[PDB]
From TrEMBL, chains A, B:
GO terms for cellular component: host cell cytoplasm. The keyword Metal-binding applies. Transmembrane segments: none annotated. Residues 293-760 form the Topo IIA-type catalytic domain. It catalyses: ATP-dependent breakage, passage and rejoining of double-stranded DNA. It comes from the Viruses. The chain holds residues 415 to 1192 of 1192 of the full protein. This is DNA topoisomerase 2.
Length: 778, 778
DNA sequence: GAGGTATGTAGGC
DNA sequence: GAGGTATGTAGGC
DNA sequence: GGCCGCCTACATACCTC
DNA sequence: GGCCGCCTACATACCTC
């Protein structure tokens, strides 16, 4: 068994006194090695005797979905392990280490005494990924096979502090375990004075003195799992079985533990399995749902919106090419991505990919390097080390305006601003892209719609001159859906058809009877075009009718020749019995693809939402964009009023500076006093010149007060009359813009509808420019 | 054979038309895959037929040092391959692919026809590492075993452009191959207008259109190696044999190719092996010498000083902990490290390590995490992802002053400033650290001296009040070396002894005759203390006298018990015959270590230098520090005079601003004209407030001219009388400092000697503070 | 007297 | 009517 | 996310005649 | 510096009675 340092005096007569430390990873392995190799000067703490160490190798395989429970009709319920379940390395290694067998029920004391270890202790990072997923899977495995071990306290975990607050002059921390508990303590505290807060997002984050202090009290922080009667149904719901049983379980939200329950947990270290599944596992499931399911407003997940915000910040100053690993490091540093860089780099590569049938029809990045062709389905991309990306600055700036970004709700990580909670683009991305992802109860599949039907719908909704504007609003009222929405034909030489309530994409083929070669030039929408030939070479009877398959397709195009038997050409027609929707050759070559859509997204609040059609998603996305435009115009009006009054005061001071002559006043106090005496308005120029994320009410409440720094901070060069004339012209331009904004707020359909129209035209032009340049705008 | 995609139609009757593409890495593999899978629309270019692909897996093993050439006395010179040479994976894979046997000499045409490929083509990055090292090793292998293959043009390479300059409106580049050629072309060019310069520091840097254009002319850029009569001695010198034979070969410098030779190379693609060894291999050897051998001024290699400069820039704003991989990415991005991050992260970890016997006695970083203990010799450090570092801000700022860093010579990469060419600290790091590195002809071994003898020497050199000042200067004159230099005793409980001309470090042991257990508590200076017990468990007779060895040592301390045979205690004394320098037990347990020093460093110019003693290194380091102090004081004097005159002009304008009243002047032109009329001095305040990297002559030549921006850029708040009084006091302080500087330049030993003394005291205090806090200054 | 074997360091492929 | 087998996507371990 | 072949020198061990 | 086991759902194939 690899990554297993055997504990001495284990497996013998003293085996009942030995514990096995199951680590979720190698960082936990290193922490355990340090703690157990403390050795001398720490006799109370454990050493490698009576303490074995084993790694779980990340998450483990869910055995609830592997067991079959067949042939229980013989009077006994026998459970048969899957061959994939039998051949797993980590589970069989754990079974070998413990010396346990599946056939035996560990009822009496002797059966447990047969074990090679007294108990198994799990050490995982104090986070959702590991405390609720890895530990949850391990607990489910043990409950599924040997419930008596959990009942008799064979399974336990070592609990580590997530957050430590140190008060100055005191060496003991508060070691809080959950974010909610720490927040409650902080709000209970009068102030955070002389308090240093440290977050341990992983076991390896602990320091040498910290791990020494932990292992000094290693007899503590060890909690035994207990099995209740209600735990069976919870284990069945969360792991294994039908997905729907957990769907209705994951649409509610995590119920926090009562104070009495937490007090019982900490007083005596006996964690019920039901409570663990209710809290930690459910929290992990909800987080994974919010992490792997896109938000319908921006059509992109937390990872991809985080990447987009990081790219916007990184490439704003200069659009120079950046290596994928460097950009991922920048995103993790600035956007507070605390998971890793393998998945982040993979997500960046996927976001920057662009080929026929790729997931992203309008990528947010332009990629320099080899990002993979349609033939490998994006799997042939090069390493992130030697691959560069750039921000599609014009497409993003026309699709995600910065002024909109200023007014979006934002996610705050540890009190610091991070990527926005959601973006509200001028056009719905959730309808314009492809995707097929499972996530802990819900599957997400989306097929992109044409960028002619969506444009028509949005323009008819916004433009009052559109003849279908009133009809479209009535459709919004009563869900008529008068205008059509159709799958995108871009980069697809086949043809889409609709039968019943389903769409099918067909590849095209050429038959040369005299040459007896079948030429296929376009395959279904998202087939990898290389796994396709493997599928057609593995169909037993399909391969019998043919002799050779050669792939002459270059990049971006498909051209495959099939040499078949001379007498089979008619026989195939007799073999497959073509229907009205697919031909005999299409049936033979699997050229038809039924496209299914699972329109499951996450709400802006954080829940799950399911749409029956793409019209519903569009109708849900419309009001958010309307309200964003309206509030953006209102904020622009307010800030422009403030800027006009500030600039008028500035010009007045520039005019009167000769008369005032503040060169003979003591300091800023006297100068501010005399400026207030002369009637100059007090206002904080920092907020006026840059409101940033300032709402209307706070903008007003902060601009009503302030200092006279605007007057004091202006340089001598601004006193020249040319600068004053430029300032006056700027005031005229700003007041004209203010009048235009006031006109915009009174527009007939809704405020800012015309601005939405020009934005739509600009983003359409940018998208066309991208399409006709292979998404290489240079 | 792994990483080998067999070419079709190879190994048969058409094998003579097939070529094998030997790639130094997987990025080259990806480039070759793209080029060969271009396929359609590129019929002239090659495809996977007639073109095999194989990876070299980085550098290969040098077979010149593995062959033995034994038993040639039988009338024939038979060469015997080493078992390590036989068992190498990559070389045997290449041999299998080609179908080459070692016994046969490929004289006639039939023997070459027996080969499975027509020729072997090497593709490597156009840089010193790969074109001169990997290709050089491959050429040496082929020349050593089958010279007739090189003679008959079996070995060839594909050459790629290092630098491409594109002129606007023209699609063809200039594709320059060497830095010298590109520099000559650029200086020949009148100006760099409408020219875009792209550097390809690796094959994967090429773009899709670029690789398509390259493979369109793939019949070109293929150069066959030719063997000359003079190539045998060159191959022997550069690879294999004695090191000294190349020592005198690497102390000269690379001789550039003549224009006629380069014209012959590019006319007919026939590269002589002698020219390749003379240019590319020698350049690689010189670069590796400069890369792996520290500079005696700062005692750190190019990578290490690059890391130091990157850390100084990164942690200057905030000393917050940074992950090792993040810091390595920052260093690579800002200091232009174009090799990787594996070696960079390893170097960062080694630089931040601190334990008894570690290489760095005074690390430049304080490490948060597990950097490894003395037991594994630093090999037990954790992964760079979960390990943090901080800059030892006070130690660095007292040891590498910033004002010194302003005046150092700097390395410019592609016209952009990078880490300094060398640091010259207040105390010689080359004398105060450990190290043992081979580098292409020279070995570097250094044992740190005590930080009491070095301090005494430097203080006696600098302080004129020291009673040995004149004696030390006379010693400098005639190399007496009156004062002693001894190895450091810190973190070493043993004792150093000197015999003849060599120093020996001894571990200490305690003998308990009644207990019959030998307890060793301190081992030699740099033994890993775990490989030590492996060495003592592998000595056949040394293990016979003993029964058990147990390691009770914790971190930072050594405590090992040896249980030996009851009657062996006296027999060991009879077995080993103790000498006057080592005892019988010390001989038995290998507790004596002779410390050897190979004082080989790199000159600031770029050569190699060898010192016979540490006194020579100290005497070489002293004048550089003296001159830096003198020039720093000169620059301070000049810039302080400039700041005095600028501030006096500023105060005069602030006083007269009421009378001037520039508020009625049209623009900056008239304002500057009237200021010049009033007698205000013109000078560029940007250089005055921050000369940054500016010499005396350029500082003067730029300060004599300038604009009046200093007057125009000052804010209104500065016109208050308190600001004017503060400015006047600042002028008084700066003039007093100027007088003190003028006094400093007239100091008796040399200018700035006293400043050197205070610097020495400050760095000694900071070092002591680190020493007594386990290098954890917090 | 016998050497050729294996190790080991930092900066790189 | 027979189900259990294998695959496959993106974000994570 | 760990792990593994190589170069370069030079000294020091062991091993075998 | 590449490469490899897992979770999550769901539809669609094949395979076998
Ligand atoms: C060895 O050390 C540990 C490894 C792991 C697993 C892991 C486990 C594996 C395994 C591979 C991996 C690997 O995943 C790979 O990442 C790749 C990243 O690029 C993308 C393109 O492709 C991904 C592979 O699809 C995936 O397989 C690790 C990445 O980060 C992890 O957490 C993964 O192959 C065999 O078992 C967990 C640990 O404890 C927490 C460890 O200590
Ligand atoms: C697989 O892909 C390639 C690999 C390579 C080699 C390499 C080769 C190896 C091998 C390992 C390695 C590995 O070195 C390892 O790095 C580690 C980095 O952390 C430090 C602590 O420890 C280092 C190991 O001491 C070293 O062994 C690569 C790192 O960068 C390289 O260049 C190395 O084990 C077997 O053969 C070259 C290529 O073409 C250019 C490749 O395509
Ligand atoms: Mg985690
Ligand atoms: Mg290179």
């Amino acid at each position: 068994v690899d990554k297993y340092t055997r504990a001495r005096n284990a497996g013998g007569k003293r085996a009942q006194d030995c514990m096995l430390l199951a680590a979720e990873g190698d960082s936990a392995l290193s922490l355990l090695r340090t703690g157990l190799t403390l050795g001398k000067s720490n006799p109370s703490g454990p050493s490698f005797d009576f303490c074995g160490m084993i790694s779980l190798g990340g998450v483990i395989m869910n055995a609830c979905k592997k067991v079959t429970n067949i042939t229980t009709d013989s009077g006994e319920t026998i459970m048969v392990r899957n061959e994939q379940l039998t051949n797993n390395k980590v589970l069989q290694g754990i079974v070998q280490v413990l010396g346990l067998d599946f056939n035996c029920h560990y009822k009496t004391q002797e059966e447990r005494a047969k074990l090679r270890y007294g108990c198994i202790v799990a050490c995982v990072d104090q986070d959702l990924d590991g405390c609720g997923k890895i530990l949850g899977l391990l607990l489910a495995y043990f409950h599924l096979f040997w419930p008596q071990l959990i009942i008799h306290g064979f399974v336990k975990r070592l609990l580590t502090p997530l957050i430590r607050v140190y008060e100055k002059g005191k060496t003991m921390p508060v070691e809080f375990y959950y974010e909610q508990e720490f927040d409650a303590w902080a709000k209970k505290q009068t102030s955070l004075v002389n308090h240093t807060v440290k977050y341990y997002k992983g076991l390896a984050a602990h320091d040498t003195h910290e791990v020494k202090s932990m292992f000094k009290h290693f007899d503590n922080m060890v909690y035994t799992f207990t099995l209740d009667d209600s735990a069976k149904e919870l284990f069945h719901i969360y792991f294994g079985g039908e997905s729907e049983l957990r769907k209705r379980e994951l649409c509610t939200g995590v119920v926090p533990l009562t104070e009495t329950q937490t007090q019982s947990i900490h007083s005596v270290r006996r964690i019920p399995c039901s409570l663990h599944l209710q809290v930690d596992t459910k929290a992990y499931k909800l987080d994974a749902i919010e992490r792997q399911i896109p938000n319908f407003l921006d059509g992109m997940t937390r990872a991809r919106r985080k990447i987009l915000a990081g790219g916007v910040k990184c490439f704003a100053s200069n659009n120079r090419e950046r290596k994928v690993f460097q950009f991922g490091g920048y995103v993790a540093d600035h956007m507070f991505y605390h998971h890793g860089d393998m998945s982040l780099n993979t997500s960046i590569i996927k976001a920057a990919q662009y080929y026929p049938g790729s997931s992203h029809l309008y990528p947010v990045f332009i990629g320099i390097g080899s990002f993979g062709s349609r033939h490998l389905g994006g799997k042939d991309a090069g390493s992130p080390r030697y691959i560069s990306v750039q921000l599609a600055s014009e497409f993003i700036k026309t699709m995600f305006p910065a002024e909109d970004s200023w007014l979006l709700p934002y996610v705050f990580e540890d009190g610091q601003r991070a990527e926005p909670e959601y973006y509200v683009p001028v056009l719905p991305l959730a309808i314009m892209e492809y995707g097929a992802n499972p996530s802990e109860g819900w599957k997400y599949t989306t097929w992109a719609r044409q960028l002619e039907d969506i444009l028509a719908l949005v323009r008819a909704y916004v433009d009052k001159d559109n003849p279908k504007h009133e009809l479209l609003h009535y459709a919004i009222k009563h869900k008529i859906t008068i205008l059509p929405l159709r799958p995108s034909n871009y980069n697809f030489k086949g043809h889409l058809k609709r039968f019943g309530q389903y769409y099918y994409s067909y590849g095209t083929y050429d038959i040369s009877e005299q040459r007896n070669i079948i030429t296929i030039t376009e395959l279904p929408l998202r087939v990898p075009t290389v796994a396709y030939i493997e599928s057609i070479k593995k169909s037993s009877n399909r391969m019998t009718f043919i002799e050779e398959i050669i792939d002459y397709s270059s990049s971006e195009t498909i051209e495959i020749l099939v040499k078949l038997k001379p007498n089979s050409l008619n026989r195939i027609v007799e073999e497959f019995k073509e229907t009205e929707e697919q031909d005999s050759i299409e049936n033979f070559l699997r050229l038809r693809n039924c496209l299914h859509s699972h329109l499951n997204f996450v709400k802006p609040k954080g829940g799950i939402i399911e749409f029956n059609s793409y019209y519903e998603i569009l109708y849900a996305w419309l009001p958010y964009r309307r309200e964003l435009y309206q509030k953006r115009l209102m904020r622009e009006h307010a800030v422009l009023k403030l800027r006009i009054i500030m600039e008028t005061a500035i010009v007045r001071y520039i005019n009167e500076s000769a008369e005032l002559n503040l060169s003979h006043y003591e300091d800023e106090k006297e100068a501010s006093r005399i400026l207030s005496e002369h009637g100059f308005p007090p206002l904080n120029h920092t907020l006026i010149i840059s409101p940033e994320f300032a709402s209307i009410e706070e903008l007003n409440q902060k601009a009503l007060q302030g200092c006279y720094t605007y007057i004091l901070s202006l340089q001598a060069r601004e006193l020249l009359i040319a600068a004053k004339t430029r300032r006056v012209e700027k005031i005229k331009k700003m007041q004209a813009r203010l009048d235009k904004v006031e006109q915009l707020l009174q527009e007939s359909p809704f405020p800012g509808a015309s601005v939405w129209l020009e934005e739509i035209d600009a983003v359409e032009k940018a998208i066309i420019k991208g399409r006709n340049t292979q998404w290489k705008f240079h």
